Ligand SMILES: COC[C@H]1CC[C@@H]2/C1=C\[C@@]1(C)CCC(C(C)C)=C1[C@@H](O[C@H]1O[C@H](CO)[C@@H](O)[C@H](O)[C@H]1O)[C@H](O)[C@@H]2C
């Protein structure tokens with residue numbers, strides 16, 4: 001319902017919604033900006049990703065609380081309510097995946113845009129896989145893997161090992177291996193190799209760039225500590 | 229849209245939504261329970277009040293951030309977006325006020341139910357007054373005052389001075405005096421008198437009751453410290 | 457800080 | 463704690 005607002009107004013409203021911690025509004029403003037059909041800049045892709053990550057982050061946190069309550073329960077109310085939250089999270093992931101496929105990814109020719117969108121595609125199938133039980137849990141898992149793999153192949157060819165999007169991609173792909181694909185050894189090897197290749201490239205960075213790479217390096221280290 | 233669910237299921241879902249911090253869902257479940265037409269118990273009135281207090285608490289926090297941004301700005305985007313949030317907060321306060329007037333208050337014969345609902349009526353007009361600028365800012369303010377006054381008159385006749393609902397009522401009515409009615413002296417006198425009359429009644433309490441009264445007494449003390 | 461309400 | 467993602 002954002003078709004009558006100017007693209008620049010939608011972006012400015014998304015920034016306002018972020019300051020106000022109104023993330024559903026932020027995501028709706030960013031959806032409307034994407035649907036204007038023009039490619040996003042670096043700053044605009046960041047806004048889109050923050051808005052939906054926060055929205056789905058809330059749904060996933062609630063789904064885990066209800067799932068946990070439900071597990072202990074084995075009336076219909078917790079299962080029904082977990083299902084309602086689950087449907088809503090599924091619709092958010094479908095919305096994000098539809099934006100990526102119509103037509104953010106097809107138009108993304110630079111490495112930083114294409115890898116960014118492919119990471120998001122892997123993330124949103126991974127959220128679908130967190131809740132999936134059907135005939136299509138396996139195809140959802142493999143859609144996540146294939147998006148993250150394509151992103152990894154491009155990033156290793158086109159971006160330095162310290163690039164924050166390449167780092168975040170590997171962090172999440174390693175989480176996918178660990179808790180979705182049940183491949184903890186692959187999760188560990190990916191996080192160790194990523195960390196080590198970034199350490200050896202820190203010397204090339206300005207003080208600003210050094211700070212954004214080391215921040216996600218620390219999350220790689222946190223997971224390695226947790227898992228080993 | 230909750231007309232087909234059992235009253236008991238709505239209440240149970242409101243409790244689940246609370247655990248999951250899904251307060252808009254919690255408020256919608258509680259609205260549907262109230263619309264069943266039966267009086268609420270003590271625990272159910274608490275659920276209703278927590279759900280809407282959290283929902284409006286989020287809208288008011290966002291409205292203050294946007295209002296503050298807008299003030300600094302004196303394009304149309306911040307004013308328009310503050311207006312959108314303002315309309316949404318107004319609709320929530322109207323929804324709560326409609327529940328109270330159709331027909332929670334009319335059916336509330338016990339002091340603890342009637343004072344509880346009258347406090348909520350005062351609170352939700354006070355939220356409307358926080359944003360009001362029109363021909364009817366003054367009537368909204370006086371609707372808040374009149375609800376809180378009726379609640380105070382009943383509580384002083386029917387409830388001990390340590391009763392948590394009487395304490396919370398006075399805490400909020402004193403905030404109303406201070407920042408809505410521009411009567412800081414009345415705000416201070418009300419908070420001091422309330423605090424002092426509760427101190428002198430603590431001796432009558434069990435350890436459990438003593439803990440819930442002293443908690444809101446501390447907020448009375450916090451405001452007196454801030455204001456003096 | 458911010459005054460308290462409840 | 464909970465593993466990190468970003
Ligand atoms: C699709 O996957 C997007 C994520 C891949 C890694 C990471 C991803 C997302 C976000 C936007 C959110 C968290 C961070 C930082 C704080 C880790 C960033 C971003 O950070 C940029 O944007 C945020 C502005 O919101 C700022 O706080 C940073 O200063 C800025 O460098 C960073 O450069 C890359 C893009």
Ligand SMILES: COC[C@H]1CC[C@@H]2/C1=C\[C@@]1(C)CCC(C(C)C)=C1[C@@H](O[C@H]1O[C@H](CO)[C@@H](O)[C@H](O)[C@H]1O)[C@H](O)[C@@H]2C
Nearest residue numbers: 274277278344345347348392393396397440443444462
């Ligand atoms: C209409 O104005 C309702 C408020 C008037 C004072 C206060 C009001 C609201 C709430 C429900 C939320 C904060 C508190 C406590 C923690 C201060 C209470 C409640 O507290 C009750 O309910 C909450 C369960 O959620 C528990 O944490 C307490 O243990 C319980 O005593 C207390 O007895 C009265 C009803």
Ligand SMILES: [Mg+2]
Nearest residue numbers: 005006007008
């Ligand atoms: Mg235009």
Ligand SMILES: [Mg+2]
Nearest residue numbers: 039107108109
């Ligand atoms: Mg292009």
Ligand SMILES: [Mg+2]
Nearest residue numbers: 233234235236
């Ligand atoms: Mg029934």
Ligand SMILES: [Mg+2]
Nearest residue numbers: 267335336337
């Ligand atoms: Mg009655």
